[PDB]
Design a protein around this ligand. Structure first.
Ligand SMILES: [Mg+2]
Ligand SMILES: [Mg+2]
Ligand SMILES: [Mg+2]
Ligand SMILES: [Mg+2]
Ligand SMILES: [Mg+2]
Ligand SMILES: [Mg+2]
Ligand SMILES: [Mg+2]
Ligand SMILES: [Mg+2]
Ligand SMILES: [Mg+2]
Ligand SMILES: [Mg+2]
Ligand SMILES: [Mg+2]
Ligand SMILES: [Mg+2]
Ligand SMILES: [Mg+2]
Ligand SMILES: [Mg+2]
Ligand SMILES: [Mg+2]
Ligand SMILES: [Mg+2]
Ligand SMILES: [Zn+2]
Lengths: 59, 151, 150, 112, 83
RNA sequence: GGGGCUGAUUCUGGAUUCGACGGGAUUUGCGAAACCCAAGGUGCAUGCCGAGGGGCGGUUGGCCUCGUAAAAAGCCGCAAAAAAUAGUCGC
RNA sequence: ACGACCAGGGCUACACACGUGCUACAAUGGCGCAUACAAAGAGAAGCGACCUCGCGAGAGCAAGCGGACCUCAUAAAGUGCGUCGUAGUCCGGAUUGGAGUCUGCAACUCGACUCCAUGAAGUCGGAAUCGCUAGUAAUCGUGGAUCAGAAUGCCACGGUGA
């Protein structure tokens, strides 16, 4: 790389609510607290009449 | 009017000071026919002014209302047909009758958290001939000095 | 090298209430009439039709540069236009009684040809009294200058 | 005070400070925060952090800020299925609550 | 809507033919003029042709329609659009 | 008849009539003509024979219907002149 | 048959304009809950004192007055002090969302009425400017009318009140 015009690029932590934590290289400095990870990506993991309510609510 | 000239009905006073001026002042300080907390606003302004300028109410209120009085004042009569704003005299009834209104036209502009809190300052202003009611008096006396020759 | 046109013989005739500043759509062979100063806005009143306003009757004359031959017509139902939030309510104003809306001036601002718009009232009219208030104001102020000074 | 992260002007009562929080307002929140232990007239002043955070499940047992906008979005999606009177008046550009639209409907129809 | 303790209102002999429709399950489009009732729970997926003033409009019933009425399905507001 | 001048206040240059109109792009939702499979719902069913239709006629050679042979449809012509405010006035 | 009967629909249509008016744009104040205080009428194919389930709209079975007697029904604006305390906001309540009640052969077109959540413009309005001389104008209800059901209307009465 060139020595001058690229910012400071170090590894920061990243924890998510799927159990899969990863620490990788970014630009900020603090823990990028993740929303959703690639396994908990709801592809095969999320998508994996009220007649009875009519009789439920009254008869 | 035309047929029967009428003289006004007499004056019934207000509780704290019995003052026939301030009883007519609670009526211009009355909106929607409610005297009730309107006079609480009156006695709130009377709490603030008669502590931020010394003397007891029944005289010390009168200083700013003396100072915002008019000497000559303008109206329209179409002396031409344009806006030749004709200056004219005033009866001493109408003197105070619009002098108090020049206080309430400033009361409709202040900005505290309560309108009873709002009126702490206008009479202590116009005692020193400052404020906004004296800006109204300065406007009408400016127009009086402007259109003086129209007699 | 032409200046601002006019059709002044309407303003002291109708009633003018609220004013709007239209555009046009010139339709193929007849624009340099306005560029030279040849015009006729005589009895030009916008008949509102189909939500799509037209000028009719106006004899914008053909030029002589463009051969006078395969030119368009002097009179044509020329499709006027104007912004939707300004157009889409005036139907309720104009569609009631013996009202039309007229043209006023084929002027041009912003290097661009225009036409003005204003709602009108009627002609079956004793159209006297505000041509009477002028001589019941001028003579009155002369009389009262005479009275106040003299 | 603090529910579902969406922060607010803090020095209000929580029961109406959660009115940017789409889901709790002037009546329901009077019981919602009373389940935590603070009533509906007291602000955030001298209110401890634990006494704030005892509500993060009590609201979550009901409809929360991120919940209600999506709830009425998916519910108007479901009610936009068929094509009844509420299948053409919700799409032509009219109100649906059954009122005169020959005058004064411009809340739905458009600012004049 | 209506108060919910009622038990909603349909025609008597057309309820009899709803019971004939549960008895049969046949697939005939019948010319039909009823509009003042609800798409019931037990009238799943049989097609008829309902009154709308002058023509006759087909409607297909749905088991997701047990709260509405059967009178919105016939627009008698003569509307082709504005202009 | 040849020759010159004039062809948008840009005249070697770059439209912003913000101006509802015709054509194109983006955001958008559920109907099959914007799209598809037979499991989640379901019975005497599909089609080729053959046959028929709003005081009256027509079209997709065809839209509702019919089983050893005949009764019922959305839109178009004959017709409610379906000009509503009519163009600027008095008769 | 320009006659008469029957099932629904429509008069409430929609980008408009023209009116008649009401709660709004706030701090006299919506906000707290009991509290200082009345008139006027109306009710038996109806009005309804109860108890309780109803803090939500209603009520099941039912007690009384054909009414100076049972009612509609305790006035709100008046007051104790404090909150959103000058914010498009706890203003301000409309487009919506499900959830519930009523009367009614039948509340979708086409009814109010309710739960709870929601919060679009609006910040004293250019010109045509209109009403009013004292209990007047502004401002707060309460009842009758048609009516199974419902009035920001029209009909009256009562407080404050320039
Ligand atoms: Mg809320
Ligand atoms: Mg609430
Ligand atoms: Mg009928
Ligand atoms: Mg009508
Ligand atoms: Mg009237
Ligand atoms: Mg009654
Ligand atoms: Mg109870
Ligand atoms: Mg109170
Ligand atoms: Mg306070
Ligand atoms: Mg509000
Ligand atoms: Mg709610
Ligand atoms: Mg707004
Ligand atoms: Mg404001
Ligand atoms: Mg009089
Ligand atoms: Mg009736
Ligand atoms: Mg009644
Ligand atoms: Zn994921």
């Amino acid at each position: 790389m060139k020595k001058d015009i690229h910012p400071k690029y170090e590894e920061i932590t990243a924890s998510c609510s799927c159990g899969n934590v990863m620490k990788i290289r970014s630009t900020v400095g603090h823990d990028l607290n993740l929303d959703v990870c690639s396994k908990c990506h709801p592809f095969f993991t999320g998508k994996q009449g009220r007649v009875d309510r009519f009789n439920k609510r009254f008869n | 009017p035309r047929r029967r000239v009428i003289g006004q009905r007499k004056i019934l006073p207000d509780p704290k000071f019995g003052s026939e001026l301030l009883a007519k002042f609670v009526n211009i300080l009355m909106v929607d026919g409610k005297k009730s907390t309107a006079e609480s606003i009156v006695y709130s302004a009377l709490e603030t002014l008669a502590q931020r300028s010394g003397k007891s109410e029944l005289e010390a209120f009168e200083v700013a209302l003396e100072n915002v009085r008019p000497t000559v004042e303008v109206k329209s009569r179409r002396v031409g047909g344009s806006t030749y704003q004709v200056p004219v005299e005033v009866r001493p009834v109408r003197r105070n009758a619009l002098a108090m209104r020049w206080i309430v036209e400033a009361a409709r502009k202040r900005g505290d958290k309560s309108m009873a809190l709002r009126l702490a300052n206008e009479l202590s202003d116009a005692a020193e001939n400052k404020g906004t009611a004296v800006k109204k008096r300065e406007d009408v006396h400016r127009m009086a000095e402007a259109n003086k020759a129209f007699a | 090298s032409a200046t601002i046109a006019l059709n002044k013989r309407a303003r002291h005739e109708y009633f003018i209430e609220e004013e709007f500043e239209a555009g046009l759509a010139l339709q193929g062979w007849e624009v340099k009439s306005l560029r030279a100063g040849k015009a006729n806005i005589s009895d030009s009143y916008v008949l509102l039709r189909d939500g799509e306003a037209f000028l009719f009757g106006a004899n914008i004359t053909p030029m002589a540069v463009a051969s006078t031959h395969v030119v368009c017509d002097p009179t044509r139902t020329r499709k006027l236009l104007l912004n939707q939030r300004e157009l889409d309510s005036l139907y309720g104003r104009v569609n009631r009684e013996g009202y039309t809306v007229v043209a006023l001036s084929l002027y041009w601002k912003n290097a661009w040809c225009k036409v003005k718009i204003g709602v009108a009232k009627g002609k079956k009219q004793h159209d006297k009294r505000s041509d009477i208030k002028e001589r019941e104001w001028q003579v009155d102020k002369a009389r009262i200058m005479k009275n106040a000074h003299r | 005070a603090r529910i579902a992260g969406i922060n607010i002007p803090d020095h209000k009562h929580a029961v109406i400070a959660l009115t940017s929080i789409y889901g709790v307002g002037k009546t329901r929140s009077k019981a919602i925060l009373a389940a935590a232990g603070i009533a509906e007239d007291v602000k955030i002043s001298e209110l401890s952090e634990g006494q704030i955070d005892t509500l993060r499940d009590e609201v979550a047992k009901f409809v929360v800020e991120g919940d209600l906008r999506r709830e009425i979005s998916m519910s108007i999606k479901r009610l936009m299925d068929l094509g009844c009177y509420r299948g053409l008046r919700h799409r032509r550009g009219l109100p649906v609550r059954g009122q005169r639209t020959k005058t004064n409907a411009r809340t739905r129809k458009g600012p004049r | 809507p209506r108060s919910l303790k009622k038990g909603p209102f349909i025609d008597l002999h057309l309820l009899k033919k709803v019971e004939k429709a549960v008895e049969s399950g046949d697939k005939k489009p019948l010319r039909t003029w009823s509009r003042r009732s609800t798409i019931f729970p037990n009238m799943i997926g049989l097609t008829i042709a309902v009154h709308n003033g002058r023509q006759h409009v087909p409607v297909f019933v749905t088991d997701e329609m047990v709260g509405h009425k059967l009178g919105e399905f016939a627009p008698t507001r003569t509307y082709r659009g504005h202009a």
